[PDB]
Amino acid sequence: GEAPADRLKALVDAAVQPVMKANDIPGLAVAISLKGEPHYFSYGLASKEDGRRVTPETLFEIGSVSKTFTATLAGYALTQDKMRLDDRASQHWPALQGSRFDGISLLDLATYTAGGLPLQFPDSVQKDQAQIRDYYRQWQPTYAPGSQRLYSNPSIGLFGYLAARSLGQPFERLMEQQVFPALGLEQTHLDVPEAALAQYAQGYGKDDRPLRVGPGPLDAEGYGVKTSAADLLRFVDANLHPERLDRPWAQALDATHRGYYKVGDMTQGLGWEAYDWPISLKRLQAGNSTPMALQPHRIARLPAPQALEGQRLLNKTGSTNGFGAYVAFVPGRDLGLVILANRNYPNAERVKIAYAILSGLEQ
Ligand X SMILES: *[B]([O])([O])C1=[C][C]=[C][C]=[C]1
Instruction: Confirm whether 355 is a catalytic residue.
Output: no
Question: Are 190 and 34 spatial neighbours (Cβ–Cβ below 8 Å)?
Answer: no
The amino acid present at 102, given as its one-letter code, is: D
- Binding partner of residue 22 among Cl ion, ligand X, none, CB under 5 to 8 Å per kind? none
175/308 with CB nearer Cl ion? 175
Q: How many helices (H) and strands (E) does the chain have?
A: 13, 15
153/187 with CB nearer ligand X? 153
Q: Which of 41, 121, 159, 345 binds Cl ion (CB under 5 A)?
A: 121
CB of 345 to ligand X, least distance (A): 13
- Binding partner of residue 64 among Cl ion, ligand X, none, CB under 5 to 8 Å per kind? ligand X
Question: Are 73 and 164 spatial neighbours (Cβ–Cβ below 8 Å)?
Answer: yes
Question: DSSP class of residue 191?
Answer: S
- Binding partner of residue 223 among Cl ion, ligand X, none, CB under 5 to 8 Å per kind? ligand X
CB of 36 to Cl ion, least distance (A): 37
120/251 with CB nearer ligand X? 120
242/318 with CB nearer ligand X? 318
Query: % helix / strand / coil in the chain, to the nearest 5?
Result: 45, 20, 35
Three-state secondary structure call for residue 308 = coil
Of 129, 110, 101, nearest to 72 by C-alpha is: 110
63/322 with CB nearer ligand X? 63
- State the maximum Cα–Cα separation within the chain, in Å, rounded to a whole number: 68
146/222 with CB nearer ligand X? 222
Of 47, 64, 166, 228, catalytic: 64
As a whole number of angstroms, the distance between CA 336 and CA 250 comes to 18
Of 250, 67, 61, 224, nearest to 159 by C-alpha is: 67
C-alpha distances (whole Å) from 300 to each of 65, 148, 279, 318 are 24, 9, 20, 24
Binding site for ligand X (CB under 6 A): 63-64, 119-120, 153, 222-223, 318-319
Question: Are 106 and 73 spatial neighbours (Cβ–Cβ below 8 Å)?
Answer: no
As a whole number of angstroms, the distance between CA 239 and CA 339 comes to 16
Question: Are 267 and 279 spatial neighbours (Cβ–Cβ below 8 Å)?
Answer: no
With CB under 5 A as the rule, give the number of residues binding Cl ion.
3
139 binds Cl ion (CB under 5 A): no
CB of 102 to ligand X, least distance (A): 25
CB of 315 to Cl ion, least distance (A): 21
Of 135, 151, 161, 204, catalytic: 151
CB of 23 to ligand X, least distance (A): 17
Q: Is 165 left (phi over 0), alpha (psi -120 to 50) or beta?
A: alpha
- Binding partner of residue 119 among Cl ion, ligand X, none, CB under 5 to 8 Å per kind? ligand X
Helices 66-79 and 247-254: angle between axes, nearest 10 degrees:
120
Closest residue to ligand X in the complex (CB): 64
- Binding partner of residue 76 among ligand X, Cl ion, none, CB under 5 to 8 Å per kind? none
64/99 with CB nearer Cl ion? 64
CB of 152 to ligand X, least distance (A): 7
Of 106, 75, 328, 73, nearest to 188 by C-alpha is: 73
153 binds Cl ion (CB under 5 A): yes
- Binding partner of residue 121 among ligand X, Cl ion, none, CB under 5 to 8 Å per kind? Cl ion
Other Cβ atoms within 10 Å of 356 Cβ, number: 18
- Binding partner of residue 63 among ligand X, Cl ion, none, CB under 5 to 8 Å per kind? ligand X
Instruction: Confirm whether 166 is a catalytic residue.
Output: no
Chain positions contacting Cl ion, by CB under 5 A? 120-121, 153
Catalytic positions are 64, 151
